[PDB]
Design a protein around this ligand. Structure first.
Ligand SMILES: Nc1nc2c(ncn2[C@H]2C[C@H](O)[C@@H](COP(=O)(O)NP(=O)(O)OP(=O)(O)O)O2)c(=O)[nH]1
Ligand SMILES: [Mn+2]
Ligand SMILES: [Mn+2]
Length: 425
DNA sequence: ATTGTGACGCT
């Protein structure tokens, strides 16, 4: 009853850019705007692998992880932009820099947690309190929410339905109670409209967002009405929303754990989890996961928005599939040097921009015929931003994997160099 | 022959 805390203390948003790499390329090349297009990596093998797809191209069935040649079968007029290649590998610098543009705008409104190259969580609780006190009890006009959907409304064309649901929501609002969670979410949504307007004005990029009381619901909400819209998921919307929500749609349950929840419990949807005790869930999935699942199926999650705008690691990876797998010593050395040169460039720029230095270098490899994505992972000291030294140390750290009696065997199908353990400088 | 990352948990 009164003592069952409902996890309505916070206002959290998740902002995620729409078809991000495509928008970056469309901004640079106006011929690509408002067209079916996609961004690929490489080009020789089946036209390259697609990593981002405009919404126009998605209507033809083009998806991420498709080969461009196959996508062209679905979409013969598909336009393609290629990721930059430097030193024989994909170079994602243009998109990392675009990301920083967006992150810097978001950071003006509130402390953010970078969650990927194109998305961040925002803790808006303090900003909402400030705005509520500034409103001095003034109601909230629908004009302030021009791109907001209220999940689960209306009850009882697309734009018309959106505005009907928004009117139902706004007429139901108790504007006098500065502590109403629903009001707090609404004011959050007003701020997020302003944030998304600023992002689009100042970068040209459109994005969607979710507003709810925690990160998992905010991330789920964001995807409900993409592209170029934001979605408010209130605490009261959760039972209906979860009643037909496949468990795999929830962040962290899209893999083996979610499959085991489904198989062991004999359920399909998030809402069915409510019928199990906390102890039952802890028994099957462990104490942490069990407590998390017990609260999350009731809409409650406590994971904080971490104050972290910069990546915690800076890494460089390249696959060598099939007959391109590295089978000589000179090959492994040359590719370790290419990787180290890109790493050195990114680290030197990171030091100048962010006043920090990495102190540990992680070397990861895959060997041909190995089932695992990473065969060996070994760390050494990173004492100097020098590509030649980083590559020699990575080699020193992996060389005892070679079983040849000049050659390399088994051949290497992946190299990975990652700088970690940053320290102020 | 999805590839290139990046966060985080387990032991
Ligand atoms: N290298 C690489 N980059 C990737 C991969 N997957 C995604 N990216 C890059 C390209 C993506 O643009 C970007 C952001 O990933 P999302 O937010 O998951 N997708 P988006 O913003 O495209 O569309 P939506 O409107 O549905 O959010 O990350 C990958 O497997 N490899
Ligand atoms: Mn995105
Ligand atoms: Mn994203």
């Amino acid at each position: 009853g009164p003592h069952m805390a409902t996890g309505q203390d916070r206002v959290v948003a998740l902002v995620d850019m729409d078809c991000f790499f495509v928008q970056v390329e469309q901004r640079q090349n106006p011929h690509l705007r408002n067209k079916p297009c996609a961004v690929v990596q490489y080009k020789s093998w089946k036209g390259g692998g697609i990593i981002a797809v405009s919404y126009e191209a998605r209507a033809f069935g083009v998806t991420r992880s498709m080969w461009a040649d196959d996508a062209k079968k679905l979409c013969p007029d598909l336009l393609l932009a290629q990721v930059r290649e430097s030193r024989g590998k994909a170079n994602l610098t243009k998109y990392r820099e675009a990301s920083v543009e967006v992150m810097e705008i978001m950071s003006r409104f509130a402390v953010i947690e970078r969650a990927s190259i194109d998305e961040a969580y925002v803790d808006l609780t303090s900003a909402v309190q400030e705005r509520l006190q500034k409103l001095q009890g003034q109601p909230i006009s629908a004009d302030l929410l021009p791109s907001t959907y209220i999940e689960g409304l209306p009850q009882g064309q697309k734009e018309g339905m959106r505005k009907q649901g928004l009117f139902q929501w706004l007429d139901s609002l108790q504007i006098d109670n500065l502590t109403s969670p629903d009001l707090q979410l609404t004011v959050g949504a007003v701020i997020v409209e302003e944030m998304r307007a600023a992002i689009e004005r100042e970068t040209g990029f459109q994005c969607s967002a979710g507003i709810s009381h925690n990160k998992v619901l905010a991330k789920l909400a964001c995807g409900l009405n993409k592209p170029n819209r934001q979605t408010l998921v209130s605490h009261g919307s959760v039972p209906q929303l979860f009643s037909q929500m496949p468990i795999r749609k929830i962040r962290s349950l899209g893999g083996k754990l979610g499959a085991s929840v489904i198989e062991i419990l004999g359920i399909e949807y998030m809402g069915e989890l409510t019928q199990f005790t906390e102890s039952q869930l802890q028994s099957h999935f462990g104490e942490k996961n069990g407590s998390w699942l017990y609260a999350m199926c009731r809409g409650i999650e406590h994971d904080p928005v971490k104050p972290r705008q910069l990546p915690k690691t800076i890494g460089c990876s390249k696959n060598f599939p099939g007959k391109t797998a590295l089978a000589t010593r000179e090959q492994v050395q040359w590719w370790l040097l290419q990787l180290a040169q890109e790493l050195e460039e990114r680290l030197t720029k990171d030091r100048n921009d962010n006043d920090r230095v990495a102190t540990q270098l992680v070397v990861s490899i895959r060997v041909q015929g190995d089932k695992r994505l990473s065969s060996l992972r070994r760390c050494c000291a990173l004492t100097r931003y020098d590509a030649h030294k980083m590559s020699h140390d990575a080699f020193t750290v992996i060389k005892n994997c070679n079983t040849s009696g000049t050659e390399w065997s088994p051949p290497l199908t992946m190299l990975f160099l990652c700088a970690t353990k940053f320290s102020a400088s």
